[PDB]
Amino acid sequence: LFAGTEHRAIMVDSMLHTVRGRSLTKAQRDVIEDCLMARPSMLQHLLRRLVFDVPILNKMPLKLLTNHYERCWKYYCLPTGTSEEELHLTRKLFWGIFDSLYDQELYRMAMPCLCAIAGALPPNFDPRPVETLNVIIPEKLDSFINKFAEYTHEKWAFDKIQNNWSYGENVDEELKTHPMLRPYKTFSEKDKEIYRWPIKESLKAMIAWEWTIEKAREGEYDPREGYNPQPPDLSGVTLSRELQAMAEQLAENYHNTWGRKKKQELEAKGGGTHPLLVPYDTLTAKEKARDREKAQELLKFLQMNGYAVTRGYFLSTPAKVLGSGGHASNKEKEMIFCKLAALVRHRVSLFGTDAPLHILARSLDARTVMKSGPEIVKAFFESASEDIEKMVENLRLGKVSTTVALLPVLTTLFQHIAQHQFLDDVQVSCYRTLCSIYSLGTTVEKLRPALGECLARLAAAAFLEPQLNEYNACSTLPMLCSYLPRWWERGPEPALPAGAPPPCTAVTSDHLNGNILRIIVNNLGIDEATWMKRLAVSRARPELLHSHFIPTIGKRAGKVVAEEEQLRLEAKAEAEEGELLVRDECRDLYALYPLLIRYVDNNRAHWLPNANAEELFMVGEIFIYWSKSHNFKREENFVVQNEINNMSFLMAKAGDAQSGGSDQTKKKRRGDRYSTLKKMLPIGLNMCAPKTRYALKDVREFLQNNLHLQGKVEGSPSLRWQ
Amino acid sequence: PIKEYRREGPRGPHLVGPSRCFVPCPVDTVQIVLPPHLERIREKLAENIHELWALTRIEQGWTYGPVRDDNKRLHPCLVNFHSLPEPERNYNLQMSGETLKTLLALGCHVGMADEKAYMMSNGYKPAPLDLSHVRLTPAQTTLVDRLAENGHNVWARDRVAQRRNPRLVPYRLLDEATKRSNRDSLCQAVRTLLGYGYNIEPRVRIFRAEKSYTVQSGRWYFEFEAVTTGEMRVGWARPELRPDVELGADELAYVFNGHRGQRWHLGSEPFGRPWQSGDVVGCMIDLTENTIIFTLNGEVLAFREIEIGDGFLPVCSLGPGQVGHLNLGQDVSSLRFFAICGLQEGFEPFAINMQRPVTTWFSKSLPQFEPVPPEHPHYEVARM
């Protein structure tokens, strides 16, 4: 996998060379397609070096390669939902891109998919070493530097004792002896500085960065010839992540102090370059370890001597707090360039809802603040519709998990009273407030009571939009006084008034949580009202959604009328079926009636009483044949084409299943053992491949019931085309 | 009958297993600190706690006097909290300091979020404030129960020098009626802290129908009643499956999970509903139309476009404590699940085929020797 990482870093280097134009762009498309084609984790290690390259991305060509790599990080986002922290750094780079301000906005959309990757996380180089020699170390540390440099002698000697090295006047790598292997006390202080120099330069680097270094806590394989160190266990000292960062940045200092000199080391010579002359973030931890072990072990010995050591997923929630600051920055834009970047961030805001504890309420407060920056616009412009999409996401922000925000709802409710004098975009917020209420349906109160003042403005009064919001806003002795009057509204069975009153039935359905039987009668009355109203426009389709809620509110005796209505829909269909046959020597209106029957299937879902239907052995089987007769019209043809018209403005088998039981009660159990009349009924289905003539080949109790299964077999033939 | 994998029931043999199986060992709380600025809150909370304790005694008819006898309702501690020396006072002081130390142990942010702020009795009827006015957060209540657990386990730790008292058991295992006292004092300390405005923020059985009975043709359907909700997982799976792997974690299995509804076919895939206990799973494998339809008491909800690699087998799997009634044919044993969506679709119960009860197999927890196959996670052997 490492070889793949090397080739990927090499192709990335080629893209950096591209950062011959169009051809190299084809090479960038090559690295893009290669990234898309792919272990995925090692690919994410090459994408980690490419994440350092992403840090280098923010140039437009590099932005494009970073965009395709971002799409690869979208495929990674799919695959994934350590390096995640680097992805957080990439999110910080995305915010930096927000600070950087056409195609770049699309690149920001790719950074929004990258933000989704951050949500999954929530689930030539130019070294610049700081000057060291100019800085002056306090001299109190010298007793420490003595012990740590002597320790350096202890380690450099102990490593030699691992190969049994010893003191010897002549240099020889093969003699297992070396002149330098003599006790540290024998060394002159100047010779001690040979060991102290990296140490003192390191501490000078710590002081140039003003990292704390102050006194505090207390601080203290066979034997071989020559000096015999048994070095203190510095490695067992445990650095914290802060101290790990400090050691990592001292290792970065060794990567820079030697890194700056290594450049000049090959500049004056006229020589080439060195592999370590690469950005530190690009480095693998192991290459970092060569200096890190020198860096950590220094901090571990500082901790061993007790010196204070400071620079002197959950972050994604903190990133939401940064978004709240951007929400405050949006408020600065609301006072009216920079707002357009916020408009670009609105797309990321849509992604933020797809991304999804008590701290999140502060983000919900920012979502409330977002409403404050949006409300001014309510009283290019499609961004407000995107904000309206964000307003749909604002419900998701409440679904994700102060008091002034509740007061703001009372203000928008007051705007409805202004509408009574006679705009619609402000009402769209009420649809979002309904979505906020639908989110609240899953789960101060006087502010909710302020909406009742709007409800008084709602009942007093294109208006279906505001009326639909009331259906969700409904989620009570006060309500009870008018609730009985709602039954009087059912006695009305003026078509326009039905659109608002239907929401009121849904309101009682929300209040249904015995007493429901009265509401069921209100629902059966709505069934008795819609049964006539649907025999006559598009407003009934809006009721069909409320009819689904009415189905949730749901009565077998009511079906006797619904069957007659379905038969009336069928008896009318017999003419509509004839309407096409009449033209043989239009039906588009029937598709609207089919939509009324689509609600009936939702009513059938309330009857799915289908469990009770097995115990019936009733007249439903004949009613199912009416739907089966409608199915014959569906595959005669033109009615199916008519449904496509209804589809432009935008099952039967469950009924068929009960029809199969006609072959039977106790006799149906015998049919299981027949592997009773269900077997003979199957023989009739063979005759359906080719009316009464088939029955004669076998009776009112049989030949009639067989006709249902035969017509169902014709519907099965209609299903055979699939 | 010990551990078990089955037990008889009125509807039939319910499946069980593998069941689940100590001495108290409370965590130290004394080492935790409750520093000076909060020590004043320790004194105030100790005062209000001692007062509420005095009410708890006086409500029982306790009255102050030199005697400590219980039946006489006389007790020295009914005197003023200031009057009590830090021993007699420590009973409501040290318990409070340990309470806050345990709150620090819980990782609570119990700082000074807010400033601190009736029947006659015999020589001592102090009043504090209306502590119950503020609703507790449910997390704070669970933490209070943790306080009762830690304090009571510590009381057992102190009583360990004195086979064993019934009260000398871990808080998790003792009867809930015993809880209704330590939980009460925990509610007292909680209403005290919240009243002062202090925030507090903190081995799987598999059942397989017999391989001889494996389906490979036609449409099929079995059922699984469930006595108890939990980590159920019922579905169809290929015979050549290895039990050691968790069920549903591989391509060989096609099962619907109990809770959450996350049916599996190699990895997670959420769908359906978390059914309540007693609901029937009723799996419906379908060949030709290679799919596996699922239900919940006749309520249709799955896996689609599979293939018959060597047929399929009726498979179930239980959780550690979960229990359910696997069902396989017998029309008399058929109920709501088959009378509705069953015959109408023509799917067949197994006892339509069979007379003998269907034997199965299950994976014993017992390790046993088994020769190493050349294919495996490559623990390769090499004779030489």
- Cβ B247 vs Cβ B317: under 8 Å: yes
Q: Does B349 touch chain A (CB under 8 A)?
A: yes
Number of H-type helices and E-type strands within chain A = 32, 2
Structure tokens at A538: 């598009």
CB-based contact A279:A125 (threshold 8 Å)? yes
Residue with tokens 């809620």: A549
B2 φψ region: left (φ > 0), alpha (ψ -120 to 50), beta (else): left
Query: How far, in Å, are A130, A525, B99 from residue A530 at the CA level?
Result: 81, 8, 64
Name the one residue in this structure whose structure tokens are 């592999």: A275
Task: Determine contact: B339 vs chain A, CB below 8 A.
Answer: yes
Give the C-alpha separation, A160 to A168, whole Å. 13
Query: How far is residue B212 CA from its own chain's centroid?
Result: 38
Instruction: Give the pair of three-digit tokens for residue A180.
Output: 């330098």
Task: Confirm if A462 and A422 have CB atoms less than 8 A apart.
Answer: no
- Asked if B204 and B252 count as a contact pair (C-beta separation under 8 A), the reply is no
In angstroms, rounded to a whole number, what is the distance separating the alpha carbons of residues B97 and B42? 6
> Phi, psi at residue B295, to the nearest 5°?
-140, 170
Interfacial residues of A (vs B; Cβ cutoff 8 Å): 610-611, 614, 657-658, 660-661, 668-669, 671-673, 675, 678
Q: Give contacts of A675 with chain B, Cβ < 8 Å.
A: 348, 352-353
**How big is the A-B interface in CB pairs under 8 Å?**
30
Experimental method: cryo-EM
Q: Do B340 and A614 touch (CB under 8 A)?
A: yes
- Token pair, residue A375, equals 């409300």
SS3 state at B303: strand
Task: Report d(CA A669, CA A683) in Å as an integer.
Answer: 19
Q: How far is B147 from chain A (nearest CA, A)?
A: 23
The pairs formed by B349-354 with CB atoms below 8 angstroms and a separation of 24 or more are B349/A672, B349/B221, B349/B222, B350/B209, B350/B213, B350/B220, B350/B222, B350/B314, B352/A672, B352/A673, B352/A675, B353/A675, B353/B213, B353/B329, B354/B213, B354/B329
- Closest CA relative to residue B312, chosen from B363, B253, B258, B265: B253
Dihedral angle sign, alpha carbons of residues B52, B56, B58, B64: negative
B 295-314 → A contacts, CB under 8 A: 297-298
Which residues in chain B have Cβ-Cβ distances shorter than 8 Å to A614? 339-340
Looking at residue B254, what DSSP letter applies?
E
B340 vs A610: CB contact, 8 Å cut-off? yes
Q: Could you identify the residue written with the tokens 């061993």?
A: A304
**Residue A372: which residues within 8 A CB-CB, separation 6 or more?**
A331, A334, A408
DSSP A651-684: -HHHHHHHHGGGG--HHHHHHHHT--HHHHHHHH
Do B157 and B24 contact (CB within 8 A), yes or no? yes
CA distance linking residue A74 with residue A36, whole number of Å: 10
Sign of the C-alpha dihedral computed for residues B308, B309, B315 and B319 taken in this order: negative
How far is the C-alpha of A156 from the C-alpha of B129, rounded, in Å? 71
Please tell me the distance from the alpha carbon of residue A341 to that of residue A334, in angstroms, as a whole number: 13
Place of tokens 């407003």: A539
**Helix, strand, coil shares, percent, chain A, to 5:** 75, 0, 25
The minimum CA-CA distance between B360 and chain A, rounded to whole Å, is 24
Chain A contact set for B353 (CB, 8 A): 675
Name the residue of chain B whose CA is nearest to A612's CA: B340
Q: How many CB atoms lie within 10 A of CB A553?
A: 22
Q: Residue A68 in contact with residue A29, Cβ under 8 Å?
A: yes
Residue B354 touches chain A, beta carbons under 8 Å: no
Nearest by CB: B339 against A614, A673, A675: A614
Chain B: closest CA distance from residue A475 (Å): 23
Partner-chain contact A673 B331, CB within 8 Å: yes
Enter the tokens of residue A157.
């000697």
Contact B344 A611 (CB under 8 A): no
Ordered strands of the B284-286 beta sheet? B284-286, B291-293, B303-304
Residue A413 CA to residue A436 CA, distance in Å, equals 14
Please give the resolution of this entry in Å, rounded to 1 decimal: 4.0
Pairing relationship of beta strands B313-317 and B360-362 according to DSSP bridges:
unpaired
Contact A575, A541 (CB under 8 A): no
Which residue in A660, A668, A673 is closest to B352 by CB distance? A673
CA distance B299 to B282: 10
- Print the SS3 string covering A464-532: HHHHHHHHHHCCCHHHHHHHHHHHHHHCCCCCHHHHCHHHHHHHHHHCCCCCHHHHHHHHHHHHHHHHH
d(CA A491, CA B205): 60
Q: Which residues contact A602 (CB under 8 A, 6 or more apart)?
A: A544, A547, A548, A551
- Do the Cβ atoms of A61 and A20 come closer than 8 Å? no
- Looking at beta carbons, which residues of chain A come within 8 Å of B282? none
Q: Please list every residue in chain B followed by a chain break, i.e. its C lies more than 2.5 Å from the next written N.
A: 21, 117, 162, 202, 301
β-partners of residue B206 are B317
